Design a protein around this ligand. Structure first.
Ligand SMILES: C[S@@+](CC[C@H](N)C(=O)[O-])C[C@H]1O[C@@H](n2cnc3c(N)ncnc32)[C@H](O)[C@@H]1O
Length: 244
């Protein structure tokens, strides 16, 4: 190898770490910019009706990474005996959740929170929650910090109740198009809008949850289609239990 060949490889590491840190430093900005630049923004129901002891028993629920509430307001409208804590670290997204007319404070408490560093106990009482919902959120978090998210959620969960996980899986469509310029690491990619996407394997995700004290209930790939002309989709869909 040349002298410039050797130089270029140490340059690649250096620039790539610069890129990674900038992307991590601005995780919140890029998600906030995402919301400020757009507005065209069932397994869950089954498990809510599952842990109920009575028939119409009230349950309390934490939607971690609520966005503008696409997975929140439906669950509130179908089920009347459910209270949802909701957080997100994008202020603009929070405005949207507080701003649409379905928002009723007898049913829904939304707050800002960076799940990697802000204590959920600041706004969610300890071991108070029956279901936490991590839907397409963990994959936005740096793989090295994902366990922080799971540790944080742990404090909030009533023992014997569970996290409902769903996120991008191995060989999902986006992973199969990113130019290697956008690869940040193994299964870790950056989108054009600066937000990041991790593509989970069943084994890696299971290890994350067990390293932070959960037990595997369900951990399976699920496959779906999107219309263009059909696009194959791979999600990882799981359920992890906080032990009693
Ligand atoms: C693709 S949206 C998913 C929203 C929602 N779970 C749903 O079902 O539609 C990803 C959301 O995760 C949020 N997010 C990413 N990292 C976060 C973090 N560290 N703490 C809190 N929210 C985060 C972003 O603000 C964004 O709104």
């Amino acid at each position: 190898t040349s002298e410039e060949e050797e130089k270029l490889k140490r340059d690649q590491t250096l620039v790539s770490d610069f890129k990674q840190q900038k992307l991590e430093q601005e995780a919140q900005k890029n998600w906030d910019l995402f919301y400020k630049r757009n507005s065209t923004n069932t397994r869950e129901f089954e498990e809510l009706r599952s842990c109920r002891e009575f028939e119409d028993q009230k349950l309390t629920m934490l939607e971690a990474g609520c966005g503008v509430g696409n997975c929140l307001f439906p669950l509130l409208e179908e089920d009347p005996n459910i209270f949802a804590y909701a957080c997100d670290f994008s202020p603009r997204a929070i405005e949207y959740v507080k701003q649409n007319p379905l928002y009723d404070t007898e049913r829904c408490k939304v707050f800002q929170c960076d799940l990697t560093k802000d204590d959920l106990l600041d706004h969610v009482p300890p071991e108070s929650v029956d279901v936490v919902m991590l839907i397409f959120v963990l994959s936005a978090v740096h793989p090295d910090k994902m366990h922080l998210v799971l540790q944080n959620i742990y404090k909030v969960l009533k023992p014997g109740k569970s996290v409902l996980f769903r996120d991008y899986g191995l060989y999902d469509h986006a992973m199969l198009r990113f130019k290697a310029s956008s690869k940040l690491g193994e299964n870790f990619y950056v989108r054009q809008d600066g937000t990041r996407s991790y593509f989970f394997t069943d084994d890696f995700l299971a290890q994350l949850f067990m390293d932070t004290g959960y037990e595997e209930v369900v951990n399976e790939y699920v496959f779906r289609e999107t219309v263009n002309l059909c696009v194959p989709r791979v999600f990882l869909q799981s359920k992890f239990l906080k032990p009693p």
